[PDB]
Amino acid sequence: LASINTDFAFSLYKELVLKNPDTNIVFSPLSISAALALVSLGAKGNTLEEILEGLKFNLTETSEADIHQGFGHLLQRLNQPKDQVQISTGSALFIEKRQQILTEFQEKAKTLYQAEAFTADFQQPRQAKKLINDYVRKQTQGMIKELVSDLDKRTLMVLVNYIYFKAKWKVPFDPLDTFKSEFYCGKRRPVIVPMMSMEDLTTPYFRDEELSCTVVELKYTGNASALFILPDQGRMQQVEASLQPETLRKWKNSLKPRMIDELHLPKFSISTDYSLEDVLSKLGIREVFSTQADLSAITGTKDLRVSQVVHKAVLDVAETGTEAAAATGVKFVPMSAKLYPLTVYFNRPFLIMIFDTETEIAPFIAKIANPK
């Protein structure tokens, strides 16, 4: 399941980069997969089959029922605060007023995914826009306030999906060590950003000479970790091309505790909005969006199809973990005698993957092209 989801993650990543070159990317392969699996609960025939296979499942080896129990158990576990890690996630369907939603589907949606399907009047855009955003504002207790822009009048169905998280570093950054540093973003003008830094960090490290990148794992205090991949100068495109579950397995097998004499990591809060129909079509999920959609297990008719899939991911990196630390005064920084210090400075584009350590599923995958 971890491997299936990771394969989906990297497939999606590549399609997203192709769409948006040289830009920050942040998404959840976990939450996106869960939202699409929620739709597959109401699908049948080739509509159903294409969703599950686009998610990288092999249906000769895996049951549709196991797929829903799989994401089901995981999501029931994750939004629950445990050891100071909270991965907050949710999905919802909004269906045009003309159509009825079957109680059977709604019961399964709540049971398996803690999700609901609501009626919306899309013929009145501002009203439907407000209904969706109000729901997500309530659900996230203010964390996401305006998930959706101007929706088309002809919308039959929008699938809505979000993720954000809170966690604390095993080794926090001292906010007094945060300083303004240049990030080499390849822009016309220099880009100066808040740079966190620490010294004498013992953390898992791997220098990958084949792929010309450095891999540093930073642990959170709970069952979670952040993997930071820094391609060598010039080597981002090649590292992006090499992303496959096998490469990730290699990195994870090859990590060893190392003493990093100085670490520089940008402090940032990046949120993204994706309308995912195009990239999902490129992954072979197509019928669900088409006139040939079978969503008869949602409506009891063949009139429904997914019009939009909206995904918002928020990733924060700061001194305490996801949360910024308050700073007072001025710190004296003495130069070390240290002769051949190991330094790792994330001041050019890098990639991040956040892992649930119990399963190795990645709630977040990101490329930080510019953290400003």
Side-chain angles (χ1 to χ4, degrees), residues 52-60 62-63:
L52 299 171
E53 297 187 335
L55 296 184
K56 311 295 186 190
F57 295 104
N58 181 321
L59 297 178
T60 78
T62 321
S63 45

Side-chain angles (χ1 to χ4, degrees), residues 168-179 181-187 190-199:
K168 298 197 179 193
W169 292 128
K170 191 194 187 165
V171 187
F173 288 83
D174 183 337
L176 278 179
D177 288 321
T178 306
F179 71 108
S181 208
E182 178 163 14
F183 193 89
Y184 296 94
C185 189
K187 294 304 174 212
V191 174
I192 308 296
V193 302
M195 193 71 76
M196 312 188 293
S197 91
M198 55 164 69
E199 291 172 14

